[PDB]
Design a protein around this ligand. Structure first.
Ligand SMILES: [Mg+2]
Ligand SMILES: [Mg+2]
Ligand SMILES: [Mg+2]
Ligand SMILES: [Mg+2]
Ligand SMILES: [Mg+2]
Ligand SMILES: [Mg+2]
Ligand SMILES: [Mg+2]
Ligand SMILES: [Mg+2]
Ligand SMILES: [Mg+2]
Ligand SMILES: [Mg+2]
Ligand SMILES: [Mg+2]
Ligand SMILES: [Zn+2]
Ligand SMILES: [Zn+2]
Lengths: 99, 71, 177, 266, 38, 42, 162
RNA sequence: CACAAACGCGUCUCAGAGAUAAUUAAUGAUUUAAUCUUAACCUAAUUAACUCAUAAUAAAUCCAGCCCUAGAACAGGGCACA
């Protein structure tokens, strides 16, 4: 019974561990986890927490590039919100449809 | 960057007998009780005293002799 | 990148000593980052089973600051086990008796309630003032920023800034101060 | 090679002695009252080692004093080495006295019962008479149960020990156990007579510990006699410093000496 | 002093002052009018 | 005054030896970031 | 500013009032249409205990408050600024606005405990020995409630009781 | 009290500093008067507690046998004067 319960809970435990590692790596770059996640999602970058943690552990340059992209997206979103202008659009804020 | 510190000094060298001088730097030894030894190890490694105590037969028999190794 | 196995492992799991100034800083915010560093929650290689833990040295403990009237309201209660041996000491009295105890208890509470709490607490060093032994000083790597900005006093402001700050109201000449 | 002697200060403290408890004697006062004195014989008092104030406590220095001589054949190798380097035979009881830095004495200095003068207040520390594992009635003084009103196997039982709701007993509960074999200190013991030839101190009141046992004597730390050491020899008693032999027995201003005119009231 | 939940002046010389975290109706002419808000 | 390689170690001598090993591997081209061996049919 | 000068010359007391030059208001306020000083300088919902340059403009040299009929502020801002001045004085700001006592500065006391955002007086609050349970808890007040209308760039409400 | 000990009915000793709650007055604005102040600055008269000076232990690796005012066993103190 405990084996079944722990098999169910293993996904949650590993997801929480991945989230903690992502928080560690993002705070190491001076960026918060919710902002990093939402800005990476806004850039249409569909990478799960497992891949993000693997990149943080083994690809520091790639993870720093992702953090810089997320910070750029956050800055563009803040600038757009402050401006409230339809014409001004950020370079990385453009939305690409399916092909 | 900063230069590499180099420490090289032999104060056990004696001009009368270098054969005894060489063994003067190697004949250093010390023995302490279990309590003081555990306290010293904990102070050195910044840990608690509960880790250094030995374990019993029940735990020492169940350890896997050949754990799997990756990479 | 192209390191041997043993040096690569040593570099990955190397311990780090951090410095933290405690002058004019809130104990809760200091203890938050102290607990983060002690647990190793700042490392992407962190794991609960792993022994990843970093040392933190906090100075200027006696110069700690409490927000609000916590100095007069917050209490610490202990019990010696013997009947009639239950004591409740005010925060000010506890700080006067031992400056370290405040931040020590704050970090002890903020740390997780497992058996590793003692192990990570043994890695913590707290000093009332800027009097740190050289053996610990030589191990410091970096200093964490202060979580709270210390406000300036009136005399600490520069005269150019004082003049640049406009006079909101004009006092009458007939009034006496 | 005497160490420099510093002037007495109001915040200074003096070193103590280690004597042997001989017995008890009566002593009558000039007002007709009768007190009981205890004889403490200073056989071998010697300063063994000196510990710096910073290395011992950070407030006061520590002076180590040895008791009466013992045999070399029953002491450990480290103790024998320490005494060989010191130059003195091993002592029985080794004690530490907290003294101020201005009253330090060179190790190896002997001490005599003339260190205390007639009329002074001393504190006595010793292990009391150990009565072993004694019952609660003898230990804490608990009253027993009635002897013959039907009580069954209870005449000396402690009775109830705790409460029902607590479901446990408090650590401060008084229970039978070891009694007597512990170090106790009696404060404010007045000294009346000092015998120089035999190095004997007559201390008023009872002395904790059995006879023929080592006793640690120091000045009174009570606030009533905090500054009584001004008239006393500050560093210690030096028999060679004065170059004058003290009388055989020094009495207090109220002690009725054995040679007396048989005082009568008027 | 009388401890009350509601304080009211019993004469024109009673004055209300906030001291020690409580309210106090103090009167000098009539000392019996000393009231302390609980 | 140009960094060619770096190496960690427990002691300074071991770190220097590891740095020398890393520099030698970089010079010889046998690096962890090298081209993987080509397994194809020419 | 008016100053009272007393001169003693042979059992004779001379009391005189002397008028000194005083600084005036800056020529250009951002909102000249505002009747209230703070409300016209657009510092409303902006100042705090940290802003000492604004609080020090109108306070007595001994740390006393200034009358509203002379200052000209609205009632709410007057109360808020009074609270901020009290908080700064309790925290330790305005070091030069204390009375000079040559006799009392020699007998030093215990070091001043560092504090900020203090609401009540340090000498009037008794320690909470019960502290309450989770559902009923005696929360510790921090800061003055009059400052709840300040601008919040983060948007999170200011915790007045913790 | 038919043991050299134990015992009371017999004898000796019993403490300095800070700190406070209630409550007193100095100085002082909001509220240029006054006002002990969930306004500051230092204030002084101040309960019991509670801590701290101070007090005790606080010299590691000889322990076969013999004594002990030391002790259930285990431990501890002595075995050179004689
Ligand atoms: Mg599923
Ligand atoms: Mg016995
Ligand atoms: Mg009876
Ligand atoms: Mg019956
Ligand atoms: Mg019976
Ligand atoms: Mg029966
Ligand atoms: Mg229970
Ligand atoms: Mg006035
Ligand atoms: Mg009056
Ligand atoms: Mg103490
Ligand atoms: Mg022995
Ligand atoms: Zn009245
Ligand atoms: Zn207004």
């Amino acid at each position: 019974v405990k084996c079944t319960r722990a098999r169910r809970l293993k996904k949650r435990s590993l997801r929480t561990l991945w989230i903690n590692r992502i928080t560690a790596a993002s705070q190491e770059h001076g960026l918060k986890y919710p902002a990093f996640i939402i800005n990476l999602i806004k850039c249409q970058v569909e990478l799960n927490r497992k891949v993000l943690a693997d990149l943080a552990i083994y690809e520091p340059k790639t993870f720093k590039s992702l953090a810089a992209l997320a910070k750029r997206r956050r800055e563009e979103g803040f600038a757009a919100a402050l401006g409230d202008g339809k014409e001004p659009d950020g370079i990385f804020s453009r939305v690409v449809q399916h092909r | 960057t900063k230069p590499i510190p180099r420490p090289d000094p032999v104060h056990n060298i004696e001009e009368t007998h270098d054969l005894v001088l060489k063994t003067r730097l190697e004949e250093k030894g010390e023995h302490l009780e279990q309590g003081p030894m555990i306290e010293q190890l904990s102070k050195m490694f910044f840990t608690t005293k509960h880790r250094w105590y030995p374990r019993g037969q029940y735990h020492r028999r169940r350890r896997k002799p050949n754990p799997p190794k990756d990479r | 990148s192209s390191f041997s196995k043993a040096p690569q492992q040593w570099a990955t799991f190397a311990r780090v000593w951090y410095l933290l100034d405690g002058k004019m800083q809130p104990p809760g915010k200091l203890a938050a980052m102290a607990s983060v560093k002690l647990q190793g929650l700042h490392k992407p290689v962190y794991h609960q089973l792993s022994d990843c833990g970093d040392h933190v040295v906090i100075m200027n403990t006696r110069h700690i600051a409490f927000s609000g009237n916590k100095w007069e309201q917050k209490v610490y209660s202990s019990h010696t086990g013997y009947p009639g041996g239950f004591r409740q000491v005010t925060a000010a009295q506890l700080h006067q008796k031992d400056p370290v105890a405040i931040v020590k208890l704050a970090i002890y509470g903020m740390l997780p309630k497992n058996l590793h709490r003692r192990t990570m607490m043994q890695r913590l060093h707290l000093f009332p003032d800027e009097d740190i032994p050289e053996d610990i000083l030589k191990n410091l790597v970096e200093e964490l920023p202060q979580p709270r900005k210390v406000p300036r006093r009136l005399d600490e402001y520069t005269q150019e800034e004082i003049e640049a700050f406009p006079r909101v109201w004009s006092p009458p000449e007939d009034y006496r101060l | 090679e005497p160490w420099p002697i510093h002037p007495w200060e109001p915040g200074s403290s003096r070193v103590g002695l280690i004597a042997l408890k001989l017995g008890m004697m009566p002593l009558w006062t000039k007002d007709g009252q009768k007190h009981v004195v205890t004889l403490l014989q200073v056989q071998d008092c010697h300063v063994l080692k000196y510990t710096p104030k910073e290395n011992h406590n950070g407030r006061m220095a520590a002076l180590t004093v040895g008791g009466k001589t013992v045999s070399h054949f029953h002491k450990s190798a480290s103790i024998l080495e320490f005494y060989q380097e010191l130059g003195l035979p091993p002592k029985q009881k080794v004690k530490i006295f907290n003294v101020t830095e201005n009253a330090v004495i060179k190790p190896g200095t002997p001490l005599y019962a003339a260190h205390f003068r007639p009329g002074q207040y001393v504190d006595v520390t010793a292990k009391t008479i150990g009565k072993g594992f004694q019952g609660v009635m003898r230990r804490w003084g608990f009253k027993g149960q009635p002897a013959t009103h039907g009580q069954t196997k209870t005449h000396r039982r402690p009775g109830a020990i705790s409460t029902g709701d607590v479901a446990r007993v408090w650590p401060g509960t008084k229970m039978p156990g070891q009694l007597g074999n512990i170090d106790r200190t009696a404060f404010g013991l007045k000294v009346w007579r000092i015998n120089t030839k035999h190095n004997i101190i007559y201390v008023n009141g009872s002395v904790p510990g059995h006879k023929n046992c080592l006793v640690k004597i120091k000045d009174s730390k009570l606030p009533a006699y905090k500054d009584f050491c001004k008239n006393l020899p500050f560093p210690t008693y030096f028999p060679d410093g004065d170059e004058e032999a003290l009388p055989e027995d020094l009495y207090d201003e109220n002690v009725c000496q054995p040679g007396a005119p048989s005082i009568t009231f008027t | 002093f009388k401890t009350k939940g509601v304080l009211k002046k019993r004469c024109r010389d009673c004055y209300l002052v906030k001291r020690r975290g409580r309210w106090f109706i103090y009167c000098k002419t009539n000392p019996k009018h000393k009231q302390r808000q609980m | 005054r140009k960094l060619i390689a770096e190496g960690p170690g427990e002691t300074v001598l071991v770190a220097e030896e590891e740095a020398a090993r890393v520099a030698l591997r970089k010079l010889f081209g046998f690096t962890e970031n090298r081209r993987p061996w080509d397994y194809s049919k020419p | 500013f008016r100053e009272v000068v007393e001169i003693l010359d042979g059992k004779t007391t001379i009391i005189e009032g002397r008028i000194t030059e005083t600084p005036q208001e800056s020529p250009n306020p951002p909102n000249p249409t505002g009747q209230c000083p703070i409300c016209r300088w657009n510092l409303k919902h902006k100042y705090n205990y940290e802003d000492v340059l604004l609080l020090s403009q109108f306070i007595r040299p001994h740390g006393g408050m200034l009358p509203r009929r002379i200052t000209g502020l609205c009632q709410e801002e007057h109360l808020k600024i009074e609270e901020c001045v009290k908080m700064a004085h309790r925290a330790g700001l305005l070091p030069n606005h204390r009375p000079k006592l040559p006799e009392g500065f020699v007998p030093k006391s215990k070091p001043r405990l560092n504090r900020y955002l203090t609401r009540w007086s340090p000498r009037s609050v008794k320690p909470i020995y019960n502290k309450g349970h989770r559902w009923n808890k005696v929360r510790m007040p921090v800061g003055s409630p009059l400052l709840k209308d300040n601008v919040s760039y983060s948007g999170r409400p200011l915790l007045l009781y913790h």
